[PDB]
Write an enzyme that holds these catalytic residues in place. Sequence first.
Site, PDB file in Angstrom:
ATOM      1  N   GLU A  11       0.796  -1.231   0.000  1.00 25.48           N
ATOM      2  CA  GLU A  11       0.000   0.000   0.000  1.00 25.48           C
ATOM      3  C   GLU A  11       0.830   1.283   0.000  1.00 25.48           C
ATOM      4  O   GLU A  11       0.363   2.327  -0.459  1.00 25.48           O
ATOM      5  CB  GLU A  11      -0.981   0.017   1.183  1.00 25.48           C
ATOM      6  CG  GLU A  11      -2.051  -1.073   1.150  1.00 25.48           C
ATOM      7  CD  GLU A  11      -3.050  -0.928   0.000  1.00 25.48           C
ATOM      8  OE1 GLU A  11      -3.050   0.112  -0.696  1.00 25.48           O
ATOM      9  OE2 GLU A  11      -3.849  -1.864  -0.200  1.00 25.48           O
ATOM     10  N   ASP A  20      -6.139   6.165  -5.218  1.00 25.75           N
ATOM     11  CA  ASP A  20      -5.622   4.800  -5.299  1.00 25.75           C
ATOM     12  C   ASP A  20      -5.609   4.293  -6.749  1.00 25.75           C
ATOM     13  O   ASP A  20      -5.870   5.064  -7.687  1.00 25.75           O
ATOM     14  CB  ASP A  20      -6.419   3.859  -4.381  1.00 25.75           C
ATOM     15  CG  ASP A  20      -7.871   3.661  -4.828  1.00 25.75           C
ATOM     16  OD1 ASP A  20      -8.244   4.049  -5.960  1.00 25.75           O
ATOM     17  OD2 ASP A  20      -8.650   3.098  -4.028  1.00 25.75           O
TER      18      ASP A  20
END
EC number: 3.2.1.17
Length: 162
Positions: A11, A20
Site C-alpha cells: 500500500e 488509489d
Amino acid sequence: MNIFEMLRIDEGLRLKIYKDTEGYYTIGIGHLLTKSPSLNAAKSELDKAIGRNTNGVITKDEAEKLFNQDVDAAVRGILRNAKLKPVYDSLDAVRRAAAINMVFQMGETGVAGFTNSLRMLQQKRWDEAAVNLAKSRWYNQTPNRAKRVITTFRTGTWDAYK
Ligand SMILES: Fc1cccc(F)c1CBr
C-alpha cells in the site's frame, strides 16, 4: 514479515490525500476515504476518521493508527463472513496474511466471485488455487501485487516480500 509489514509494502505510505489504483481518494497506508469523486467529501471523511480539522494532511502516527484499525476491521470481517471464516481458519498464519491482504484491497464484496479459489485453498490445492486466483480482474489490474499475494498462497512462505 507479518500482515502489517506486508500491507505496508503493498500500500505504501502517503500523508496527503491521493487517488488509489482505482481513482478513489485515499490516505495513509491505503486507507480508502470514499468512492465519491468529490475531494471535499473525501476531506470530510478524513476529518471524521482522525477527529480533527486536517485540511487533507495527516501525520505518520495518524496514518499508522488508521492502518491498525483497518487491519483489525478486515480480519474481524473475515471471521464474521460465513463463507470466508471456514477457509481462513483452515489456513496457516502466513496464508492467513495473504487472505487479509485481499480483503484489505478489495473488501468482502470484491472477493465474492472467488468461490472456486476459496474451495481450492480450503482443499490445500495450492498450485491449482494460484492458477485460479490469477483468472481475475484483480490480477489484471494489479498484477505485481496479485503475483506477490498469489505466491504467498502458493508457497506458504514470505518469499515474494523478501
Ligand atoms: F482464502 C481466503 C479466506 C478469506 C478471505 C480471502 F480473501 C481469501 C482468499 Br480468496
